[PDB]
């Protein structure tokens, strides 16, 4: 009995081989407009024959779809995209309509792949060779790119309309944002997609427990005064200025920070409001010979924050707060 399944898998293999061969023969031949006029009816006739064989159960439908998602995932030059995406749109009624996890695997794979292709298309220019002269005139380039952006936008829109399960957990790249920029455009702010997007930002963004962070909202412009304990006074112990936030892991990182690329990594964590103020204290408090570059490092950290400025608020003041803290030191004496 398995001989029939063997034969069916083998014919599916040679069919997808010949389709890949023709799609690459496009760019491996295109220099003559009489050959292109032949090639257009060639791809149209082969797509007609492939559909007529696919609707007759002569092609194993589950290896072909996996090869298809691999083929749209693996491509890197954009001059195959408008035909391969049309091939995707043909079997769109059978890929995403399946009613790590084996079930509904092509749907999540297809939306991860389509968002990645959206990002790579929205990154740069359409030409990939950059080896010949007069590379780009800007107008035809933007005219081509807007079409592919429109196609991918409509496909992501139908993905979000389709799946009622709605599991877009991304295990590879955690939450890069392009989809609010899509969903602002359509429907003129229809609140169902908005509420689903808020539940999406709750679920798929991997929100940390952040018990301490709940406390952070309370923090305002606040200062620090250190007062010696009565017991401490007898032993002449010195009080350590109080801190709104610990960021102890951050403190630990600072000690081993030297001779490593710490600056790019901190950027990832938005601790500028609390950690930067805390960092100043650390630089001031314990290194005479331990951290020779500590003040300079602190300046670099502050400088990085200064460079990454988007608003007047909570930027210029930081300096004012630092001045107040310095003034506070005088008060303590």
């Amino acid at each position: 009995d398995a001989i029939s399944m063997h034969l069916l898998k083998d014919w599916t293999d040679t069919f997808v081989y010949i389709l890949e061969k023709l799609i690459f023969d496009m760019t491996n031949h295109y220099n003559d407009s009489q050959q292109l006029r032949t090639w257009k009816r060639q791809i149209s006739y082969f797509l007609k024959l492939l559909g007529n064989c696919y609707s007759l159960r002569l092609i194993n439908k589950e290896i072909f779809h996996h090869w298809l998602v691999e083929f749209i995932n693996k491509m890197e030059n954009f001059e195959f995209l408008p035909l391969s995406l049309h091939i995707l749109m043909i079997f769109w009624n059978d890929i995403c309509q399946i009613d790590q996890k084996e079930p509904f695997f092509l749907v999540t794979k297809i939306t991860d792949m389509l968002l990645h292709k959206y990002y790579i298309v929205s990154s740069s220019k359409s030409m990939i060779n950059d080896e010949n002269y007069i590379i780009n005139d800007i107008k035809k380039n933007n005219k081509i790119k807007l079409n592919i952006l429109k196609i991918l936008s409509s496909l992501i829109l139908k993905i979000f309309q389709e799946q009622s399960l709605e599991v877009f957990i991304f295990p590879t790249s955690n939450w890069e944002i392009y989809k609010p920029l899509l969903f602002e455009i359509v429907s003129n702010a229809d609140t169902n997609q908005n509420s689903d997007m808020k539940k999406k930002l709750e679920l798929i963004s991997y929100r940390n427990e952040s018990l301490k962070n709940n406390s952070s909202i309370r923090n305002v412009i606040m200062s620090a005064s250190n007062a010696n304990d009565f017991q401490l006074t007898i032993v002449t112990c010195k009080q350590f200025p109080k801190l709104s936030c610990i960021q102890l892991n951050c403190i630990d990182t600072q000690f081993t920070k030297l001779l490593d690329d710490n600056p790019t990594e901190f950027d990832w964590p938005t601790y500028v409001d609390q950690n930067p103020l805390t960092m100043h204290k650390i630089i001031q408090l314990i290194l005479w010979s331990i951290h020779p570059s500590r003040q300079f490092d602190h300046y670099e950290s502050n400088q990085l924050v200064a460079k990454l400025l988007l608003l007047r608020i909570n930027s210029t003041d930081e300096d004012l707060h630092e001045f107040q803290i310095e003034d506070a030191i005088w008060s303590l004496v």
């Binding site: 292109l36 049309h86 749109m89 005139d137």
Partner: protein, 876 residues
């Protein structure tokens, strides 16, 4: 081997009583009393809600069950009122037309049940008129309790669950977005109404001090008295008087206001809405035109380029829920006719009645009665066990008398050049057996006429002509003009008057060229692609073809062209197999001018038992020789009349439609023409011939019955039949052993055995076309029209190809007027003809393999009255 366990197949009839006598008093409305009956009825109901009472317009009828005496109303301090007639009856009345005390006992029992059910619940459920819909949206369907009394005295109630979209509305809906596209309804009556325009307040006003008395009356009828509720929003309504008299408005153009009677005030807590079902083109296939492959070739071409006392009529009357339509669509296109020219409607019926599902059932899907599985848990069991004696459902063995499996009828087909019979379950193998029609070939010349995408219709038209030639069905030598156009095509744009005139001039120049030829070589047809499979563009393509025929006929007569429509998706979907165009080819072969000769008909085999007719037994039995079937229907609004006529083997088929309109002279004209065509077919057969006219959709009113009783006589013997398609009575099957496709569907290994290919005498028996006939033990009530029950009810029943307990599809036949005696023999003969007429419906292009239980002419009438009532007509 029908070893069906007749016990434990659950019906929908809950037995509630046991009746051997029922007594009644009728108090006539003597001497034109000052609304004495209307006052004294609610004055009698205020004492106790257990009484059985009803009222004709001013006459009073009090009833009493088996033993207890009838109540007497509270009269004046001296009593001069005596009852007008005392009587009693039993469970054997005049069955084919109900006497007017049983049709009042049923209304009294239904009113008592709905009032007691409304009072027992927590004021959350009112009678909508043959319904009980909750004020909150908890069920979101209509529960319908229908009482009936059988012939042995078994007073049962049948339960129905109609899934209509009746949603209650509130104060936060009185805006344009809701009132623009909803149809409103008055809740304890069932009349439809529109809101009166506002009074500078915002569509709600304070109640006047008089009409709050109406709320007190709601404590005595319908039992939902919200006098304790501290908030109550009142609104100003106005109903349509025609719907007060059964005349539902024109369903083609709903939501249009009409003249008023007088304003009224009504609580907004009980006013319901019905939503306009909408239609769109499609989804999932890029309607923004990237599924067009030439867009992809355009983008790769750009890359190539870059590479360089005012409410008592509303508190007393009720509407029987058949006079409110199930669905009504939004766009509502307009067709036009004359006072002698009925051509476009017959054209649309001709080209929608014989296409399989390629049109797609272009409107909205059906609203059918979902079947009840059980009712053991809730509140209506408690209220019935409180109100009555018992409450348990009837088994299969109490109602079903005769259960038997029907045979498989044969059909004619030509294999090589022999003319062989074959089973009717062999339609999709028609290409893989080289089957060819027995009745000869029909020939034409084709002309596709597209304007959307030329590069795909160029590939579509020669392969359709080649698959029509390649089976021996005649020669479709497709049309060819002088210029560079590929043959059988004219890629135009902007379908309009001037281009259609020039195309008609081109075709008439071709016809003037080809002068001398035979008559049967030139019929031509035009194929038009529907850009969107809906109704609004089907009627426009019909208009375009009618303009072409009008401009061709006046320049040259005797030319006969036809219209075929095909959806654009079926042209440009690349998943359309070439094993499918074959069916489309047959859907041209049933339109060519030999119209009433089609692909195949029933084989007319030898009988199974000979049974030489000697001396009788000598009663008035007939033993007819040739039946004639006819199915006519009339829409809910009283305009459209549809009809289909067929032989006992499906030979002399006619399908027609008549837009009568509001009048009643065209209706008598159409009912005369139906009998004209029936007698025209009747003057072809032997003699002793009995025509069987079947009224669709349950209800058989009195005007059509007056017409058919005037027209009939000794020219032919009729036999009226009422037909029901939707499962209002819902037998739910529950067994695991008899239908032997269920062990093969349970695990696909239970039977699972080898064929033992030395016993090789088998047959491929396609399920969904294995119908089982039932003849019930007792007559059944019709699904609508509580004025006439039936005699000798029966049914065709088709199982579902699945395992386990589920409802089965059914087709209920109800005999109403038998010509001779022994009506059970006539019912079994009607079922044995109906099975053949149901098996014919796949070979004709009427539907796909979805209903092998409905006979083909009734399915044709149902498709016409499903997809043709929605167009509105103007007479010019």
């Amino acid at each position: 081997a029908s070893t069906y366990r007749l016990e434990d197949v659950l019906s929908s009839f809950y037995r509630v009583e046991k009746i051997k006598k029922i007594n009644y008093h009728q108090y006539i409305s003597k001497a034109q009393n000052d609304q004495w009956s209307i006052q004294m009825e609610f004055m009698l109901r205020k004492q106790d809600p257990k009484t059985l009472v009803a009222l004709l317009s001013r006459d009073l009828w009090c009833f009493s069950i088996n033993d207890d005496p009838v109540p007497t109303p509270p009269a004046i301090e001296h009593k001069p009122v005596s009852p007008d007639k005392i009587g009693t009856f039993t469970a054997d009345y005049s069955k084919p037309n109900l006497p007017p005390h049983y049709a009042l006992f049923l209304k009294a029992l239904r009113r008592k049940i709905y009032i007691n059910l409304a009072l027992g619940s927590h004021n959350k459920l009112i009678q909508f008129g043959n319904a009980c819909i909750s004020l909150s949206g908890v069920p979101n369907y209509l529960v319908q309790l229908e009482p009936h009394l059988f012939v042995n005295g078994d007073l049962t109630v049948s339960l129905c669950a109609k899934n209509m979209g009746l949603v209650p509305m509130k104060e936060e809906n009185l805006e344009e977005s809701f009132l623009s596209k909803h149809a409103l309804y008055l809740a304890p009556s069932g009349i439809r109404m529109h809101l009166a325009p506002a009074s500078k307040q915002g569509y709600l006003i304070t109640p006047p001090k008089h009409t709050e008395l109406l709320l007190t009356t709601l404590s005595v009828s319908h039992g939902i008295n919200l006098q304790n509720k501290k908030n109550l929003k009142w609104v100003a309504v106005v109903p349509d008087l025609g719907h007060l008299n059964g005349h539902t408005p024109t369903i083609a153009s709903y939501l249009t206001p009409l003249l008023e009677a007088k304003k009224l005030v009504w609580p907004l807590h009980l006013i319901f809405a019905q939503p306009v079902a909408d239609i769109e083109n499609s989804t999932s296939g890029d309607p923004s035109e990237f599924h067009c492959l030439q867009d992809a070739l355009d983008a790769i071409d750009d890359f190539i380029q870059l590479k360089q006392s005012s409410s008592l009529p509303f508190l007393l009357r009720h509407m029987p829920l058949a006079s409110i339509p199930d669905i009504f669509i939004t766009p509502t296109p307009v067709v036009t006719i004359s006072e002698k020219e009925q051509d476009i409607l017959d054209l649309i019926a001709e080209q929608v009645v014989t296409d399989y599902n390629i049109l797609g059932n272009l409107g909205i899907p059906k609203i059918a009665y979902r079947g009840v599985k059980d009712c053991q848990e809730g509140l209506i069991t408690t209220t019935m066990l409180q109100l009555f004696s018992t409450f348990d459902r009837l088994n299969g063995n109490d109602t079903i008398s005769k259960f038997y499996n029907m045979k498989q009828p044969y059909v004619f087909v030509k294999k090589h050049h022999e003319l062989i019979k074959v089973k009717h379950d062999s339609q999709p193998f028609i290409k893989f057996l080289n089957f060819r029609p027995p009745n000869g070939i029909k020939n034409f010349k084709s002309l596709l006429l597209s304007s959307s995408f030329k590069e795909d219709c160029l590939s579509f038209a020669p392969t359709l002509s080649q698959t029509y030639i390649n089976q021996e069905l005649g020669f479709c030598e497709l049309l060819k003009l002088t210029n560079e156009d590929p043959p059988g095509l004219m890629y135009l744009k902007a379908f309009d008057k001037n281009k259609l005139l020039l195309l008609a001039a081109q075709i008439v120049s071709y016809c003037s060229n080809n002068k001398n030829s035979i008559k049967n070589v030139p019929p031509i047809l035009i194929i038009l692609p529907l850009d969107n499979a809906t109704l609004t563009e089907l009627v426009d393509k019909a208009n375009i073809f009618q303009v072409i025929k009008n401009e061709v006929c006046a320049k040259m007569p005797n030319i006969e062209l036809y219209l075929k429509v095909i959806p654009m998706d079926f042209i440009r979907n690349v998943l359309v197999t070439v094993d499918q165009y074959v069916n489309v080819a047959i859907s041209i072969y049933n339109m060519l001018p030999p119209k009433s000769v089609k692909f195949t008909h029933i084989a007319h085999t030898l009988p199974e038992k000979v049974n030489f007719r000697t001396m009788q037994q000598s009663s008035s039995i007939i033993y007819y020789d040739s039946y004639i079937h006819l199915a006519y229907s009339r829409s809910v609004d009283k305009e459209w009349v549809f009809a289909a006529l067929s032989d006992s083997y499906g030979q002399g088929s006619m399908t027609k439609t008549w837009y009568v309109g509001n009048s009643r002279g065209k209706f008598d004209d159409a009912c005369n023409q139906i009998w004209n065509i029936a007698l025209n077919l009747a003057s072809k057969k032997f003699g002793k011939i009995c025509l069987i006219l079947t009224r669709l959709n349950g209800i058989l009113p009195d005007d059509e019955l007056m017409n058919w009783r005037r027209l009939s006589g000794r020219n032919i013997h009729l036999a009226v039949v009422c037909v029901d398609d939707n499962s209002k009575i819902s037998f739910i099957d529950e067994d695991k052993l008899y239908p032997s496709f269920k062990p093969i569907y349970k695990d696909t290994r239970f039977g699972g055995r080898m064929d033992m290919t030395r016993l090789y005498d088998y047959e491929i028996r396609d399920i969904d076309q294995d119908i089982h006939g039932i003849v019930f033990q007792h007559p059944f009530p019709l699904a609508h029209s509580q004025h006439r029950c039936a005699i000798r009810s029966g049914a065709l029943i088709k199982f579902k190809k699945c395992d386990g307990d589920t409802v089965w599809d059914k087709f209920a036949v109800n005999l109403l007027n038998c010509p001779h005696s022994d009506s059970t023999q006539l019912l079994e003969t009607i079922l044995e003809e109906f099975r053949n007429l149901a098996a014919l419906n796949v070979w004709y292009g009427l539907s796909d393999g979805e209903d092998g239980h409905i006979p083909w002419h009734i399915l044709a009438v149902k498709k016409m009255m499903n997809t043709l009532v929605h167009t509105r007509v103007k007479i010019a």
